[PDB]
Write a protein that binds this ligand. Structure first.
Ligand SMILES: Cc1cc2nc3c(=O)[nH]c(=O)nc-3n(C[C@H](O)[C@H](O)[C@H](O)COP(=O)(O)OP(=O)(O)OC[C@H]3O[C@@H](n4cnc5c(N)ncnc54)[C@H](O)[C@@H]3O)c2cc1C
Ligand SMILES: CC(C)=CCc1ccc2c(C[C@H](N)C(=O)O)c[nH]c2c1
Length: 426
């Protein structure tokens, strides 16, 4: 009745928890046959951005919900099945599954002229039902449209093997004995390359823009938990980058003696990739670094340095696009295509609509999603109020110009936040 929550992954569950605490009536619609979001997919063989060898890269204590710790048997970085099991247990413990419509996919959300929203949902049969809700919380994630590079290098149609996105990547054993190129230096790319490196005969890592390769751990500490080490917070920006970047050099050297492009910036500049493996896999010959792909010559891949390589498959680890197909008008955006959401959550001109989890932070997203859920629940029942619309887009303006200044007009900087000052206002 009162709130329709689109999604029962980690964000939609935090939302149902927050709605349930205030006694707010809500239903939670979710396409998958179970709660869990992306983490439930690798274990069910479903096209999703995860893969059979995916673990957390955030500390479990900063990753689980604050009122519901993960089993103490869990390691610091649990596997995706452990994470998916944990999230099923939360929904159980929180009495949410009575409110979750599984196998229910939202197809349109439209704001009626009188205030409420008509939500059309496709049930398990495909039977479309059309319902009305006072408010809609969107928690559908932003990793659900693959982003393939344009242009795909020449000869793509000549190619004897398979070209695929990480979305379609599933397990390294699906390429045992083959020769595979991985394109990208993202979190998906180093993980997939390291996985392939123990199954494919040969694994090539084709990277064209250098990213910073930071281990999951410095001084025995997770880097997401160093982020709030009080001794680290009293650092100035180039005081910590001073120590962070010398921390890297003793731990690993710099990227330039692994055959890796080093980046056009220092750390924290655009993004850093977290790995424990990829540098050592290079140094054991299990992964060979390569520049950008230049063309597909039929059976081989040609890289821009002139070198060539026989290749049975290319997995594009190039990330995801941010879309909302159930929203005819789109997520609020500026013409630059930057997200326009007051405090990263609230459209300035659309009462009753809220976006949760549509942020990308230093470290784990859970505390932020909890903060967002708690605020939204108090907006839904009037304990909290919003500024007038002109004032809301003033804060969006300040956020955005500061975004173009710091991270630049890259793709996806419109949702970038630092855990600390963001949580600090909830
Ligand atoms: C490979 C990978 C690794 C990551 N690792 C970490 C990590 O270690 N630590 C961390 O803190 N974060 C990590 N993240 C970030 C990750 O997004 C969050 O941890 C978490 O998954 C957020 O879940 P969510 O609920 O926001 O979205 P999702 O997990 O995407 O869940 C959204 C849900 O919406 C559902 N849905 C229902 N109806 C619809 C509909 N009509 N249209 C669309 N969707 C619908 C989808 O089925 C899906 O279950 C990782 C992300 C990726 C891709
Ligand atoms: C150098 C340094 C201390 C960086 C701090 C840091 C940055 C990013 C992450 C992530 C990515 C996460 N998967 C996300 O994008 O939400 C997990 N832990 C992190 C820690």
């Amino acid at each position: 009745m009162r709130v329709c929550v689109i999604g029962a992954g980690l964000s939609g569950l935090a939302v149902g928890h927050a709605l349930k605490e205030r006694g707010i009536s809500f239903v939670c619609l979710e396409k998958a046959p179970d709660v869990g979001g992306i983490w439930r997919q690798p274990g069910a063989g479903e096209r999703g951005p995860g893969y059979r060898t995916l673990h957390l890269n955030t500390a479990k204590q900063l990753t689980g919900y604050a009122d519901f710790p993960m089993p103490d048997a869990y390691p610091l970085y649990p596997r995706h099945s452990q994470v998916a099991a944990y999230l099923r247990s939360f929904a159980e413990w929180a009495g949410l599954l009575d409110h979750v419509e599984l196998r229910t996919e939202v197809v349109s959300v439209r704001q009626d002229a009188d205030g409420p929203w008509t939500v059309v949902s496709r049930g398990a049969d495909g039977a479309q039902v059309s319902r009305r809700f006072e408010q809609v919380v969107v928690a559908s994630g932003h990793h659900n449209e693959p982003a393939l590079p344009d242009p795909l290098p020449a000869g793509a149609d000549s190619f004897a093997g398979t070209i695929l996105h990480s979305l379609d990547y599933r397990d390294g054993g699906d390429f045992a004995g083959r020769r595979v190129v991985v394109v990208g230096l993202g979190a998906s790319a180093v993980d997939i390359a390291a996985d392939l490196s123990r199954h494919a005969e040969r694994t090539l890592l084709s990277v064209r823009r250098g990213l910073h390769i930071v281990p999951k751990q410095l001084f025995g500490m997770s880097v997401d938990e160093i982020a709030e080490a009080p001794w680290w917070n009293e650092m100035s920006f180039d005081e910590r980058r001073r120590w962070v970047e010398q921390a890297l050099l003793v731990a690993r050297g710099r990227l330039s003696d692994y055959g890796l492009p080093e980046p056009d910036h220092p750390v924290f500049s655009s993004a850093t990739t977290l790995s424990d493996e990829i540098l050592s896999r290079i140094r054991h010959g299990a992964v060979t670094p390569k520049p950008a792909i230049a063309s597909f010559d039929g059976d081989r891949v040609v890289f821009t340095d002139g070198t060539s390589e026989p290749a049975d498959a290319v997995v594009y680890c190039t990330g995801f696009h941010m879309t909302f197909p159930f929203l005819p008008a789109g997520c609020p955006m500026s013409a630059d295509g930057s997200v326009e959401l007051y405090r990263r959550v609230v459209p300035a001109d659309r009462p009753g609509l809220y976006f949760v989890g549509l942020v990308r932070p230093v470290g784990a997203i859970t505390r932020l999603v909890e903060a967002q859920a708690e605020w939204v629940a108090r907006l839904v029942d009037g304990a909290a109020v919003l500024p007038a619309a002109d004032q809301m887009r003033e804060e969006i303006g300040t956020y955005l110009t500061g975004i173009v200044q710091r991270y630049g007009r890259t793709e996806g900087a419109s949702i970038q936040v630092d855990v600390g000052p963001y949580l600090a206002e909830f």
